[PDB]
């Protein structure tokens, strides 16, 4: 399920490991993998084959209790560049691609990378617009119709200290800057999403200029063979709005299959499980959908992507693009849990007022709602009553436009991904590429550390794989014991079994720990990354 074989997980990672680290080598300058006489090189080999670890191929995916005898020799696949091995060069070359790729796509000054120094470096973050972000999370919904609660989030709340919310997640702003551009907001919170708007739409000017119109190849959206930004084999952890996994399953013509859901199965593309499902301890994996427009509501309608074929994959490249390295990387992640956040905020805090006395403004009184006989312990009064973010009357009470849309989360599917037209010469049918994805989480990383709210805990747990977004000071939140996950996990942290391996494809420890020793810039660091994934095809 994910509570037991789990974290008592390291223990049986001691039928196991304290011999420290061999191809562990990833940190110095040009020489302890180019001088003369060494144990570990007979491996990191070929331009064919891409050898890696495993047993005498006890077959590979499945069961629990294995043997040890006898076997063979090798290969196994991977799909980037940004990463030629480990020290040919100690500053110039990529944050190089940061002084030769961008010229007059021009240079800088005080106010927008203003919008840069005090939202990704130091030490000051939240907890209940946490609640409000799952009053937020992703597909359409009927919250497409109202205004005033964050209206007054503003009205008290830029006036705080140069550092506020929401800049790692991937749904906080879509259909709003689709509709209204004229009448709510000022000009130093009003000019930092437009002028940094169209030079990544002049990055629309900078990843379909310098190539090519005249000759294309083999039927996958476009010119797909592609490379590493634009075709029909990148869908993903992408777990926000709707287009890409059945992007794996409604574009046509190549090969022969298998997957997993770490679960069970049958696929229909039906939907509407109904009122009988609030659903908090049991056994199933079929996919929810919930209300359609030019679709149509209820039970039935067909299932294609929500919207088209330019944006949601927009998600997925610049995804392979600029947040941590923003963040001091100050941050990190885990998992969470769902019966306290599931409900003491959907009724009992509106009762009887003597209401209707004229317009509400400014904060000192026995009125507006956060006060001194409707909180003492035991439920719902210090992260929407800690921190005076303070609000208004209609958004968080009432009961027929936020009951609606709740809960059935994260069971999920295990990939066989197929990069584009570059495996046809007899390598890879069952030489499948898993490469690994998400299916129903939240959004945190915050060092509300020394912070005497989350008392070393209770609610929420860990769920740990992909290989960029990870985090250095850990050994403080998942537990059972005294001194565990670190003193055998100090340099590239502690590894798993099962979602597709941080291994088995194209990913190691890649923007953190090689300029975790050379961070050229705000910025030159930022001209090669919008260039960061090369290779060797036709």
């Amino acid at each position: 399920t994910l509570d037991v074989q789990m974290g008592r997980f390291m223990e049986t990672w001691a039928d196991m490991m304290p011999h420290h680290p061999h191809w562990v080598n990833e940190h110095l300058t040009i020489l302890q993998f180019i001088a003369p006489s060494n144990p570990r090189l007979r491996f990191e080999l070929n331009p064919a084959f891409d050898f890696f670890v495993a047993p005498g191929d006890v077959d590979l995916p499945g069961p629990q209790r294995p043997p040890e005898a006898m076997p063979t020799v090798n290969a196994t696949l991977r799909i980037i560049n940004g990463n030629i091995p480990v020290p040919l060069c100690p500053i110039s070359f990529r944050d190089c691609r940061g002084t030769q790729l961008g010229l007059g796509r021009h240079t800088m000054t005080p106010a927008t990378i203003k919008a840069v120094k005090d939202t990704f470096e130091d030490r000051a973050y939240p907890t209940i617009f946490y609640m409000l972000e799952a009053v937020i999370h992703g597909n359409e919904r009927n919250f497409c119709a109202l205004l005033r609660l964050l209206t007054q989030c503003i009205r008290g709340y830029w006036e705080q200290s140069h550092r506020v919310a929401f800049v790692n997640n991937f749904h906080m702003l879509m259909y709003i800057t689709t509709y209204l551009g004229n009448g709510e907001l000022p000009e130093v919170c009003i000019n930092i999403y437009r002028d940094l708007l169209q030079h990544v739409r002049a990055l629309r000017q900078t990843i379909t200029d310098f190539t090519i119109q005249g000759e294309g190849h083999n039927g996958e959206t476009s010119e797909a063979l592609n490379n590493i930004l634009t075709d029909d084999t990148f869908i993903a952890p992408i777990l926000w709005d709707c287009d890409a996994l059945i992007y794996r399953d409604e574009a046509a013509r190549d090969r022969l299959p298998a997957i997993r859901v770490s679960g069970r199965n049958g696929y229909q593309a039906l939907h509407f499980v109904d009122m009988a499902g609030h659903n908090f301890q049991r056994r199933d994996n079929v996919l929810i959908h919930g209300r359609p427009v030019r679709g149509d509501t209820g039970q039935a309608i067909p299932i294609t992507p929500h919207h088209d074929r330019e944006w949601g994959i927009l998600s997925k490249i610049y995804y392979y693009i600029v947040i941590p390295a923003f963040s001091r990387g100050s941050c990190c992640t885990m998992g969470v849990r769902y019966d306290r956040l599931y409900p003491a905020l959907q009724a009992v805090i509106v009762p009887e007022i003597p209401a209707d006395e004229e317009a509400p403004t400014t904060p000192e009184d026995p009125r507006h709602p956060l006060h001194a006989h409707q909180l003492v312990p035991n439920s719902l009064n210090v992260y929407f009553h800690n921190a005076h973010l303070t609000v208004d009357g209609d958004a968080l009470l009432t009961l027929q436009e936020l009951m609606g849309d709740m809960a059935e989360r994260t069971t999920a599917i295990l990939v066989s991904s197929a990069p584009d037209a570059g495996a046809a010469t007899a390598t890879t049918r069952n030489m499948r590429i898993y490469d690994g994805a998400l299916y129903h989480g939240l959004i945190m990383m915050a060092y509300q550390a020394y912070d005497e709210t989350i008392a070393t805990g209770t609610f929420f747990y860990p769920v740990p794989v992909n290989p960029l977004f990870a985090c250095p000071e850990h050994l403080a939140s998942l537990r059972g014991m005294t001194n565990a996950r670190r003193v055998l996990a100090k340099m590239v942290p502690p590894i798993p079994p099962f979602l597709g391996a941080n291994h088995h494809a194209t990913i190691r420890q890649p923007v953190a720990y090689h300029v975790t020793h050379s961070k050229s810039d705000f910025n030159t660091l930022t001209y090669s990354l919008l260039g960061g994934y090369f290779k060797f095809t036709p």
């Binding site: 497409c144 709510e184 009724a347 209707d356 009470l397």
Partner: protein
């Protein structure tokens, strides 16, 4: 409401749960007695949220009902386009 009779938690508990002001969850508990538990929790879920929906009826005396919300049929759409009221107004009817 009666008779089930009143949620003391306990593991009865009762599905709604028709209260406002549960200064009750704690309050005392203190703690739960000797029963199996698991759901338990569900009974509190469904009926507490019912205790919300029925706790309203009102606050509709100052709304400002819901809206067409979008551009979509709207079974005519053939003599005027559809547009949705995103509710920046302070919905009060004063």
């Amino acid at each position: 409401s009666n008779p089930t009779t009143f949620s003391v938690e306990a593991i009865a508990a009762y599905t709604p749960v028709a209260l406002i002001r549960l200064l009750n969850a704690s309050g005392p508990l203190q703690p739960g007695h000797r029963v199996d538990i698991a759901d338990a929790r569900s009974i509190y879920t469904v009926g507490a949220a019912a205790s919300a929906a029925r706790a309203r009826a009102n606050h509709n005396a100052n709304t400002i009902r819901r809206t067409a919300m979008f551009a979509e049929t709207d079974p005519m759409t053939w003599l005027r386009p559809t547009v949705g009221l995103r509710r920046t107004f302070n919905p009060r009817i004063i």
